[PDB]
Design a protein around this nucleic acid. Structure first.
Ligand SMILES: N#C[C@]1(COP(=O)(O)OP(=O)(O)OP(=O)(O)O)/C(=C\F)[C@@H](n2cnc3c(=O)[nH]c(N)nc32)C[C@@H]1O
Lengths: 406, 553
DNA sequence: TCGCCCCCCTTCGGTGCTTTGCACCGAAGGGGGGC
């Protein structure tokens, strides 16, 4: 096969990201995986004259108890030339988000049969570490389309489409979307009857080279105001402050007839009776908040942003937007793993599910604003990751001024 | 000899040319020491003579070795380094003796003139040009270039290490039941073979090394305990650090104190209870390395405490994979923490300390979490797994922390240990307003261009207060207003502010801060019995908040 | 008058915030240690 010429973006160099420490079991797995990949020619041993590096680690599902090597090409993908610029990106089908079930398949191994431009290979270097630093790091670079590189789906696009078209025509009401190393396949059948054809798909895919998602049960959680017949000064204050925040989102919301019952330097526990011209304001705004917001449309030319808040007792609220206060989606994630303790595992699972919904809905992941210290997240998150992709994220400390979302 | 290994190709950074730097003077003993090796390196083929169309030069000198009778040669390649390509360094960390398992037979070897046995890429040699001076006014110097990796070049360590790794690779795979720790040119070789077969395998290793051009001189071939290795002494059952000698001075300078703190940090890996907070405090605000700093009373005490710890002998033990790792932490005060890692009681694998202040405002629970994370990372590096923890914090304390703290946080499997002083939350904000408690509507206003401000409050029971503030900020007057409300209220108080800044700090329940104003607020939160802290938006005419803002004008 | 690596403690300067200082963070200065 002939290599497609690839370039980094103008004025950018390759990734220079240090490897982080790995447990004994992940090091053994990476060494087992890469020595076999070296033999089959998919990667080659390199030295330190290659000045580039990207972190590697490994994930193992109990969805399937084999280790999977995961190279965090997030930096490399950021610096790689756009492929929608050069007529080779993959269009997202707006039908996928409406199908009964969508199963996700890991098809990254198909990339390993297409050679990568040798001039670009040096940017794909990674380094396996050493327990107690018994040895120097061992370095490799890819010779084929790497898993996790955003260029691999683009270069492989024409091949995969011909691998799929028999399945596409024999089953025309199934919609398949390739994202990174993944296939998102959905249609409207019984769970048994959906598992029918995904496995027919697997064996056609095996002929040449985990969870069942259900988009309809992705309830949107609106802004809910409390309910009771007796209100204290503090209850009204927190309410007036919550609606004042929601005035930056929704439209025509008033607090004038709620603010001035608080007139005076009242005690926080004093029970203020509602006027008729206050209960008027509240029940009026109560439903401006019932059905969601007018005039907010997805723009594929901009990034998706996701914000998560911890709510306690296993619950996590999230908003996905592109410009602030113009939310495309707001939701609430829940957990019941049976251990009932780990906040970091919960948030890691919350990010994967939110990122998966964005792929299903819009075709790409959002950049996450995580409610966690950088160093607490980096200490534990890889122990719970189970996607073959990794979204962008940053770390925030936003004290809950309003907790409108609960 | 020179290795028949293939050279590693190297490049200059794009756009740049080689160095051009004239030579400087040197002594009797450091020109014979070089000519002795320069004409000798040439006979061994380490360097070749060049001449004038090589336009490059780089100055040369020498330095003593712990050999002492031997001399080491170094060339000031600082400018060639700046113009040489970047390298990805393969030394990812430093091996530690606590990560070693007990071995029945142990050997430690070194390679002789290790850099000088790895060839240098042909096309790059002309950039390593230098000139040997010969007491300087004597003669114009002779010009040489390197054919092997020079000491002082940026690329030599990484290219050596990778070269050593390729050479050891056949021996490692053929002998997987032999542990070889490879640190630069130093080889630790342990096995479970009886000493007869062990020395067989060693001689096999040495012979393989020599075919590839690496000598192993007898001088550096340790065959018997104690083994000197990486700054430690390896015994059969235990390991020690080589003696740590601390400075003792009448008058300390900044640099002296910098030296002292470094020795104590190095000592803390096996000496439990080492502290450096009060001694490092002296380094703050100082503006010269030569500046004489008098020790504070607290620093002398801390120094004397550390000297008593180092007077007693200590040892680590080796790793037993058949038993769990256990990490135990103790609180020491002023944000300092020490720990010990072990598998059986009273036999430490190693110790350590954590004493960083992350952020302007924090509490003991946060720092304890950061100590656990540092230990957890160290454990992955040395043993490949995290340990079980024994923490001086009660389960109710931790449970209260992660339910009322809005960021996600976690600690692994841990068991409570009662080693006072315990880690506790020093106060808790009430979740709901307090019946009977007075209500304070606080506000603080500053003017950004003035530097002058006001902080104050009004009250549902009837108190008002305004205090003028000079050389303040917007955020300070808001903290100042909360400070006054805590100052003038009883043991229970409801407070309403309009600063998300101030609320955010206080709601995190800090017990220490770099700000004396926040520390004053913290001391008062601890003295209270019940505090409720609520927020409202400013400038919306909300009763209470409106009239106090009306007053701070 | 040199090189590479890890660690700790302090200082400095860039970044984003519905900011006007503040908190966070990475880099660089100093020290320890290894070869
Ligand atoms: N490889 C290797 C060795 C081992 O250094 P080592 O003490 O073992 O001495 P040696 O091997 O040269 O010769 P020997 O074993 O005594 O017969 C080094 C690191 F690991 C290098 N290195 C040591 N100190 C220094 C130093 O300050 N400046 C520079 N620029 N480089 C140094 C050179 C040497 O090559």
């Amino acid at each position: 096969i002939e290599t497609v010429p690839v370039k980094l973006k103008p004025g950018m160099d390759g990734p220079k990201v240090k490897q982080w420490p790995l447990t004994e079991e992940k090091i053994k797995a990476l060494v087992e995986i890469c020595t076999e990949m070296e033999k089959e020619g998919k990667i080659s041993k390199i030295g330190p004259e290659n000045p580039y590096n990207t972190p590697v680690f490994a994930i193992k599902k109990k969805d399937s108890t084999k280790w999977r090597k995961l190279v965090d090409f997030r930096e490399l993908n950021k610096r790689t030339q756009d492929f929608w610029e050069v007529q080779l990106g993959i269009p997202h089908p707006a039908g996928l988000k409406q199908k009964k079930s969508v199963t996700v398949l890991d098809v990254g191994d198909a990339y390993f049969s297409v050679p990568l431009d040798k001039d670009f290979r040096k940017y794909t270097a990674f380094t396996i570490p050493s327990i107690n630093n018994e040895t120097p790091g061992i370095r490799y670079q890819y010779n084929v389309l790497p898993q996790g590189w955003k260029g691999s789906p683009a270069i492989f696009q024409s091949s995969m489409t011909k691998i799929l078209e028999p399945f596409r025509k024999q089953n025309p009401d199934i919609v398949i979307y390739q994202y990174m190393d993944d296939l998102y396949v959905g249609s409207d059948l019984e769970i048994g009857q959906h598992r029918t054809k995904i496995e027919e798909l697997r064996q056609h895919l095996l002929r040449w080279g985990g969870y069942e998602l259900h988009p309809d049960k992705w309830t949107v959680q609106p802004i809910v105001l409390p309910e009771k017949d007796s209100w204290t000064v503090n209850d009204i204050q927190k309410l007036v402050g919550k609606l004042n925040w929601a005035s930056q989102i929704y439209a025509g919301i008033k607090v004038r007839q709620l603010s001035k019952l608080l007139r005076g330097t009242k005690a926080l526990t004093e029970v203020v009776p509602l006027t008729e011209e206050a209960e008027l304001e509240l029940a009026e705004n109560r439903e401006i908040l019932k059905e969601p917001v007018h005039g907010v449309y997805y723009d594929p030319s901009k990034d998706l942003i996701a914000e998560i808040q911890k709510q306690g007792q296993g619950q996590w609220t999230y908003q996905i937007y592109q410009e602030p206060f113009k939310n495309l989606k707001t939701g609430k994630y829940a957990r019941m793993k049976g251990a009932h303790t780990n906040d970091v595992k919960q948030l890691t699972e919350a990010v994967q599910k939110i990122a998966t919904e964005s792929i299903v809905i819009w075709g790409k992941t959002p950049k996450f604003k995580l409610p966690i210290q950088k160093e607490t997240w980096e200490a534990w998150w890889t122990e719970y990751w189970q996607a073959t992709w990794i979204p962008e994220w940053e770390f925030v400390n936003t004290p809950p001024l309003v907790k409108l979302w609960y | 000899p020179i290795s028949p290994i293939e050279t590693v190709p190297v490049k200059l950074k794009p756009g740049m040319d080689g160095p051009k730097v004239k030579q400087w003077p040197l002594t009797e003993e450091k020109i014979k020491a070089l000519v002795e090796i320069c004409t000798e390196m040439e006979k061994e083929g380490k360097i070749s003579k060049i001449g004038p169309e090589n336009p490059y030069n780089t100055p040369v000198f020498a330095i003593k070795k712990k050999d002492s009778t031997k001399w080491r040669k170094v060339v000031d390649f600082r400018e060639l380094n700046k113009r040489t390509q970047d390298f990805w360094e393969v030394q990812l960390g430093i091996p530690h003796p606590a990560g070693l398992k007990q071995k029945k037979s142990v050997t430690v070897l070194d390679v002789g003139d290790a850099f000088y046995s790895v060839p240098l890429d042909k096309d790059f040699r002309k950039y390593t040009a230098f000139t040997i001076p010969s007491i300087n006014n004597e003669t114009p110097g002779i010009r040489y270039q390197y054919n092997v990796l020079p000491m002082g070049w940026k690329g030599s360590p990484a290219i050596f290490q990778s070269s050593m790794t390729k050479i050891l690779e056949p021996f490692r795979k053929q002998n997987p039941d032999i542990v070889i720790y490879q640190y630069m040119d130093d080889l630790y070789v342990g096995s479970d073979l009886e000493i007869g077969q062990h020395r067989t395998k060693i001689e096999e290793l040495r012979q393989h090394l020599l075919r590839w051009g690496f000598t192993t001189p007898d001088k550096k071939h340790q065959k018997e305990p104690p083994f000197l290795w990486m700054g430690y002494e390896l015994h059969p059952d235990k390991w020690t650090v080589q003696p740590i000698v601390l400075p003792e001075k009448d008058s300390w300078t900044v640099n002296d104190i910098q030296k002292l703190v470094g020795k104590l940090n190095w000592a803390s890996q096996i000496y439990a209870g080492i502290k450096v907070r009060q001694l490092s405090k002296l380094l703050r605000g100082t503006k010269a390395l030569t500046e004489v700093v008098p020790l504070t009373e607290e620093a002398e005490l801390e120094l004397a405490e550390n000297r008593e710890i180092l007077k007693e002998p200590v040892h680590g033990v080796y790793y037993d994979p058949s038993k769990d790792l256990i990490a135990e932490i103790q609180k020491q005060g002023q944000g300092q923490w020490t720990y010990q890692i072990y598998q059986e009681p009273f036999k430490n694998l190693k110790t350590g300390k954590y004493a960083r202040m992350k952020g302007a405002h924090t509490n003991d629970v946060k720092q304890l979490t950061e100590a656990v994370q540092k230990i957890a990372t160290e454990s992955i590096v040395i043993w490949g797994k995290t340990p079980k923890f024994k923490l001086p914090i009660q389960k109710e304390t931790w449970e209260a922390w992660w339910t009322e703290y809005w960021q996600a946080t976690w600690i692994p499997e841990w068991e409570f240990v009662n080693t006072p002083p315990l880690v506790k939350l020093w106060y808790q904000l009430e979740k709901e307003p307090i019946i009977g408690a007075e209500t304070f509507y606080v506000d603080g206003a500053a003017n950004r261009e003035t530097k002058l401000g006001k902080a104050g409050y009004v009250t549902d029971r009837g108190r008002q207060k305004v205090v003028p503030l000079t050389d303040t900020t917007n955020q300070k007057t808001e903290l100042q207003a909360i400070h006054l409300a805590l100052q003038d209220s009883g043991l229970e108080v409801n407070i309403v502010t309009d600063s998300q800044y101030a609320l955010g700090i206080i709601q995190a329940q800090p017990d220490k801060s770099e700000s004396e104003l926040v520390s004053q607020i913290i001391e008062q939160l601890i003295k209270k019995e019940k505090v409720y802290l609520a927020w409202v938006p400013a400038h919306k005419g909300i009763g209470g908040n409106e009239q106090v803002d009306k007053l701070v004008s």
